[PDB]
Amino acid sequence: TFEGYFDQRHTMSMAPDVTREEFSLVSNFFNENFQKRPRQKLFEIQKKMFPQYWFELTQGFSLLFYGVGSKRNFLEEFAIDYLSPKIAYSQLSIPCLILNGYNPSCNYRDVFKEITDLLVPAHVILQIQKMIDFYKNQPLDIKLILVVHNLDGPSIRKNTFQTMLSFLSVIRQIAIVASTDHIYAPLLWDNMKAQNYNFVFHDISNFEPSTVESTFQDVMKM
Template structure:
């Protein structure tokens, strides 16, 4: 037998590999756990990271200034019906916001922060429809007799009706549009297929233009050929900024730190402040019940409804369910089963964090 045969060498290597795996698996396993690592508090780690001095500042400023010379070209491409997609290393948020604040002053601009954990895409589209409706009435670019009749509020319309409204009527000035700035269109709150389909349909509307950024290497896999070339109609720009992801990183836990109660309360406060006052008051009822009954499984939905109705915060069970859906979408409230079989609501925060949260929204 020829021992120099490549096939024989490959066979010998494979045999030795499996023998080593078999011997290794029979040995004593380590009792160490990842949880045994003495990690620092997240606040301390973020504070330490903030003190790191940036390097190559002059080179980075020259690079950003070279992008600013492209602003007129970007506006022209938006007017021609293209969507702008920014990619490259570093946060594109400051660059895109500077572009919007300096070059898009003649247009209405709506910002979507895709780096947030949860985004209600229908609320975004309702807001766009309301902006367009006010724009049509205020600027009177079409005869008043040709204005579409709004028979019901936008909030009660279906997604198809809202998109149809944003796709018409035609204006006298073809370059009149609403620009949507989407930071991290591949972010966790936007990357599901349904939301991407709605964004693509939105981008194809005649009165909408999109300027977006991506950061994940596999972000283009979110779209098919039709979405890329027909609906989004992307014009790709490689614009590495080498800027830190300061704002985007606030909503993600750091790998080398354990989550602190202060950080959890801060994140929950940001979400609650974006909700209506009645929704915040309903959340406060649940939080106060949890603090006064720490040993309970939570607060029964019927009890929450009764208290909320007595305080004139909700008018029906449907209204309360709408608030609860908002809470659950943002992971502010969870449900668990009481021993008697009843579903109870609870807030997944420690007592200290919950007390801090109430003071934050107070």
């Protein structure tokens, strides 16, 4: 309850020091061994929602995946094995763009270069406006699939990057899938951003270890 908030000389050196290499070993062993079968069974059961996810994406509802545990592998498996091939074999090979929000070294201009190359026939918002005006006359067929891991990523958290991603979802011929880990993630988006994003919210918590994301921050600083 809320009353639990109102009703509320040792050092870390007293604990035995663990090196980074020693840190990796136990982490890997307990990630691979412990809770293997039940989590794999949960993943296999969760795969049953692939037709629903496909239908939602074709209707234009963006997918936001949240909950405790890593969501990179789930999105990779979905987008690679189910979404992209079926779109090609039912519309008649669809390119898929993967953005790593867990990397602080990203740049929005670099991603926009790939977007322009993949979408625009031969001041980012000015070009996005031209894309929107162009794709109005284009048929309502999915041409590019966009996957954005960690919409709460360090550089991704910034308002400009969120604005750039928000104007992307106006075009129906673009499929957007995003994931978040922060509990206060909805604080980032206002009504205008929510309207442009068109997320349908799905909790996909799986207690999957964040092995990849742990590489960009040093545990030795703790």
